[PDB]
Design a protein around this motif. Sequence first.
Motif, short mmCIF file in Angstrom:
data_model
loop_
_atom_site.label_atom_id
_atom_site.label_comp_id
_atom_site.label_asym_id
_atom_site.label_seq_id
_atom_site.Cartn_x
_atom_site.Cartn_y
_atom_site.Cartn_z
N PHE A 21 0.82 -1.20 0.00
CA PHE A 21 0.00 0.00 0.00
C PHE A 21 0.86 1.26 0.00
O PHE A 21 0.51 2.25 -0.66
CB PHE A 21 -0.98 0.01 1.17
CG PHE A 21 -2.17 0.90 0.93
CD1 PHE A 21 -3.19 0.50 0.09
CD2 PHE A 21 -2.23 2.16 1.51
CE1 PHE A 21 -4.29 1.32 -0.15
CE2 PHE A 21 -3.32 2.99 1.27
CZ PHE A 21 -4.33 2.58 0.44
N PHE A 35 -6.86 10.30 1.17
CA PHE A 35 -6.69 9.81 2.53
C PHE A 35 -6.21 11.00 3.36
O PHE A 35 -5.01 11.15 3.61
CB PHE A 35 -5.70 8.65 2.57
CG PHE A 35 -6.11 7.47 1.75
CD1 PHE A 35 -6.86 6.45 2.30
CD2 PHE A 35 -5.74 7.37 0.42
CE1 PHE A 35 -7.24 5.35 1.54
CE2 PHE A 35 -6.11 6.28 -0.35
CZ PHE A 35 -6.86 5.27 0.21
N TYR A 38 -3.50 10.71 5.99
CA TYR A 38 -2.16 10.24 5.67
C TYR A 38 -1.32 11.28 4.94
O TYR A 38 -0.11 11.08 4.80
CB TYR A 38 -2.22 8.95 4.82
CG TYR A 38 -3.06 7.84 5.43
CD1 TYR A 38 -3.26 7.76 6.80
CD2 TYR A 38 -3.66 6.89 4.62
CE1 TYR A 38 -4.04 6.75 7.36
CE2 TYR A 38 -4.45 5.88 5.17
CZ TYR A 38 -4.63 5.81 6.54
OH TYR A 38 -5.41 4.81 7.09
N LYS A 51 -4.79 2.85 12.42
CA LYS A 51 -5.73 2.51 11.36
C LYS A 51 -5.04 2.28 10.02
O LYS A 51 -5.63 1.65 9.14
CB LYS A 51 -6.81 3.60 11.23
CG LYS A 51 -7.88 3.49 12.32
CD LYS A 51 -9.02 4.49 12.12
CE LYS A 51 -10.03 4.39 13.25
NZ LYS A 51 -11.13 5.38 13.13
N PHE A 52 -3.81 2.76 9.85
CA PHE A 52 -3.06 2.41 8.65
C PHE A 52 -2.76 0.92 8.61
O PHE A 52 -3.05 0.23 7.62
CB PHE A 52 -1.76 3.22 8.53
CG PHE A 52 -1.04 2.97 7.23
CD1 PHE A 52 -1.48 3.56 6.06
CD2 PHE A 52 0.03 2.08 7.17
CE1 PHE A 52 -0.83 3.30 4.84
CE2 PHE A 52 0.68 1.82 5.97
CZ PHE A 52 0.24 2.42 4.80
N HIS A 55 -6.31 -1.02 8.58
CA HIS A 55 -7.06 -0.99 7.32
C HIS A 55 -6.31 -1.68 6.19
O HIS A 55 -6.93 -2.41 5.41
CB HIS A 55 -7.41 0.45 6.94
CG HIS A 55 -8.44 1.06 7.83
ND1 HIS A 55 -8.85 2.37 7.72
CD2 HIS A 55 -9.15 0.53 8.86
CE1 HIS A 55 -9.77 2.62 8.63
NE2 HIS A 55 -9.97 1.52 9.34
N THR A 56 -4.99 -1.46 6.06
CA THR A 56 -4.27 -2.12 4.97
C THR A 56 -4.34 -3.64 5.11
O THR A 56 -4.55 -4.35 4.12
CB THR A 56 -2.79 -1.68 4.86
OG1 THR A 56 -2.09 -1.90 6.09
CG2 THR A 56 -2.66 -0.24 4.43
N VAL A 59 -7.90 -4.82 4.06
CA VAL A 59 -8.07 -4.80 2.61
C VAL A 59 -7.36 -5.98 1.97
O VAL A 59 -7.90 -6.66 1.09
CB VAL A 59 -7.53 -3.48 2.03
CG1 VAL A 59 -7.36 -3.57 0.50
CG2 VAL A 59 -8.41 -2.32 2.44
O1 T6C Z 1 -7.30 3.65 5.86
C1 T6C Z 1 -7.45 2.98 4.64
C2 T6C Z 1 -8.67 2.94 4.00
CL1 T6C Z 1 -10.09 3.75 4.69
C3 T6C Z 1 -8.81 2.27 2.80
C4 T6C Z 1 -7.71 1.64 2.25
CL2 T6C Z 1 -7.87 0.78 0.72
C5 T6C Z 1 -6.48 1.66 2.88
C6 T6C Z 1 -6.36 2.34 4.08
CL3 T6C Z 1 -4.78 2.37 4.89
#
Ligand code: T6C
Length: 133
Positions: A21, A35, A38, A51-52, A55-56, A59
């Motif tokens: 990512f 984002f 970020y 959350k980094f 969330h990564t 995904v």
């Molecule tokens: O915080 C994120 C979100 Cl909301 C979506 C993606 Cl695809 C990746 C990250 Cl790191």
Amino acid sequence: GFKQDIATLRGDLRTYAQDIFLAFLNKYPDEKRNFKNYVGKSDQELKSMAKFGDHTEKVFNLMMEVADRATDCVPLASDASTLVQMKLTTGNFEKLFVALVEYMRASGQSFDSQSWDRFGKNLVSALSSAGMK
Ligand SMILES: Oc1c(Cl)cc(Cl)cc1Cl
């Protein structure tokens, strides 16, 4: 091949998810502007944000589930529909897979980079067929 690559990625998924990512965000800086949290942060600062990492990894776990269910790198149309119906654009997805394939080709490991290229194309096409813009 592709199925072994899913195992390889899963065996260190948080690291791979974050590094791929980050490769995507650094290759396509304009995507990072979507984002807000970020922007203005280096790789090491992003890796300190809960959350980094969370969330990564989430995904990439879903990507691995869809990959696991695919046949000959073609995802299930029902998985694509589930994705479209969950809380984007196929263009951003295509760019993530470009970064993913480049990352695999630069690795010293025998990833099946062509299969991931095909998988990304087929997922983008299935998402469009299932109604994503
Ligand atoms: O915080 C994120 C979100 Cl909301 C979506 C993606 Cl695809 C990746 C990250 Cl790191």
